[PDB]
Amino acid sequence: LDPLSETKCTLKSFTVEKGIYQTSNFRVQPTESIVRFPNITNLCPFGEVFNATRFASVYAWNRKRISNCVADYSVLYNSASFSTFKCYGVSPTKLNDLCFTNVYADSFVIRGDEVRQIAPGQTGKIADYNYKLPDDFTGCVIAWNSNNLDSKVGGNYNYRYRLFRKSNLKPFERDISTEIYQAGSTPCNGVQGFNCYFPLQSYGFQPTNGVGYQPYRVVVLSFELLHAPATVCGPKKSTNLVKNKCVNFNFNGLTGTGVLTESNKKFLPFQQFGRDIADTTDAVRDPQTLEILDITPCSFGGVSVITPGTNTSNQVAVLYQGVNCTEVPVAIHADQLTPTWRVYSTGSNVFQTRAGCLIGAEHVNNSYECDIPIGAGICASYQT
């Protein structure tokens, strides 16, 4: 309702004694979003990724790279055909709002029961000996039954994997190695022997197989983000850049709130973010046109309320600490001030102190004892 009732709410008493009190900081809220992405209009090749004529054998898992295109990932989330669409870097409903630096698609087929091994940091012979995501994987895993498209009556034995490996191979590696394994200690020079194995074995994908012994098409879609220039984005539309106004910006999925301004920072042809000492974003290069924008947070500060105490009066005065009085007219209900009251802001008596802008209190040359300490030599009191 007013700064006095906000102090009563802050103090949990319906009486407030004579003094000065902190309360909630103020800030000015953003009047619009702004969206900024590097305009590109060609769709990403997800039909090529999912509608392949044939998929890899998983020990040879096919690796595709994507760039410079638009991805409406929600189309793929909507396609009810997917028996699993499990996502780690993001919730899948977010994907349309994000931009990525690089996008890699890993593709093969497997028995639908081993889809659990595809999840990051798991174990089991596939996850162990031929394909695995790192601890800090950032993407989605997708799976679907392919019995109709990919079974042969006696089995498409074409789809094989690996039963043997000298050591658990590194994350995101592939191994073509056809070398005979030496499960017993004898050096099995040549192509065969007792205790020696051809290192790969295959699925008899007969159509009569049990659900998940059936052939399942698998893709992992994956990406890295928020440290380098984006090349892929969702379908959202860029909007007019503005300076010297509070805006809920998004540049390349780098969302935030602030006042955009023309940067004097001379970024070389390669960089795209500035970051302040607090590891937090403070400049960005515009993706539509190559200039640098400085980004400052919108105006804010501590409110402190000065009171002669409710026994004496329900008049208060307000200090906006650290604030020059010329920003208090900019604290107007054009946007919702977080302290929602705003009746002192009408002014006629506004005073600038070293501590911040003081409002509601008549400045006078007649000095007195420091009755309520505002700060920096200024005090206040209740008088005719």
Ligand X SMILES: *[C@@H]1O[C@H](CO)[C@@H](O)[C@H](O)[C@H]1NC(C)=O
Ligand Y SMILES: *[C@@H]1O[C@H](CO)[C@@H](O[C@@H]2O[C@H](CO)[C@@H](O)[C@H](O)[C@H]2NC(C)=O)[C@H](O)[C@H]1NC(C)=O
Ligand Z SMILES: *[C@@H]1O[C@H](CO)[C@@H](O[C@@H]2O[C@H](CO)[C@@H](O[C@H]3O[C@H](CO)[C@@H](O)[C@H](O)[C@@H]3O)[C@H](O)[C@H]2NC(C)=O)[C@H](O)[C@H]1NC(C)=O
**Best CA proximity match to 238, nearest among 11, 67, 70:** 70
134 CA to centre of own chain: 19
Among 192, 240, 244, 311, binds ligand X (CB under 6 A): 311
38 binds ligand X, rule: CB under 6 A? yes
Per-residue x/- marks for another protein, 82-121, CB under 8 A? -------xxx-xx--xx---x-----------------xx
Q: How far is the CB of 81 from ligand Z (least distance, A)?
A: 7
Does residue 376 touch another protein according to CB under 8 A? Answer: yes
CB 37 within 8 A of CB 238: yes
Does 194 contact its own copies by CB under 8 A?
A: yes
Can you tell me whether residue 188 is helix, strand or coil?
A: coil
Q: Which two tokens stand for residue 30?
A: 């953003």
| 47 contact, one of ligand Z, ligand X, ligand Y, none, CB 5-8 Å limit per kind | ligand Z
Q: What is the DSSP letter of 30?
A: P
What HEC string does 67-117 produce?
CCEECCHHHHHHCCCCCEEEECCCCHHHHHHCEECEEEEEEEEEEHHHHHH
**Partner whose footprint covers residue 139, from ligand Z, ligand X, another protein, none (CB < 5 to 8 Å by kind):** none
Pairing of strands 281-285, 273-275: antiparallel
13 binds, among another protein, ligand Y, ligand X, none (CB under 5 to 8 A by kind): none
Q: Most distant CA pair in the chain: distance in Å? A: 109
Instruction: Identify what 326 binds: its own copies, ligand Z, ligand Y, none; CB under 5 to 8 Å per kind.
Output: ligand Y
Helix (H) or strand (E) holding 127: helix 125-129
The least CB distance from residue 94 to another protein, in Å, is 6
221 forms bridges with which residues in the sheet? 105, 140
Q: Rule CB under 6 A: which of 365-384 touch ligand X?
A: 365
C-beta of 144: minimal distance to another protein in Å?
Answer: 23
- 271 is a contact residue toward another protein (CB under 8 A): yes
329 is an interface residue for ligand Y by CB under 6 A: no
Residue 12 or 237: the one with the smaller Cβ distance to ligand X is: 237
Is residue 324 a contact point for ligand Y (CB under 6 A)?
yes
Number of residues forming the site for ligand Y (CB under 6 A): 2
Q: What is the per-residue binding string for ligand X in 270-299, x denoting contact by CB under 6 A?
A: -----------------xx-----------
What is the C-alpha to C-alpha distance for residues 305 and 19, in angstroms, rounded to an integer?
9
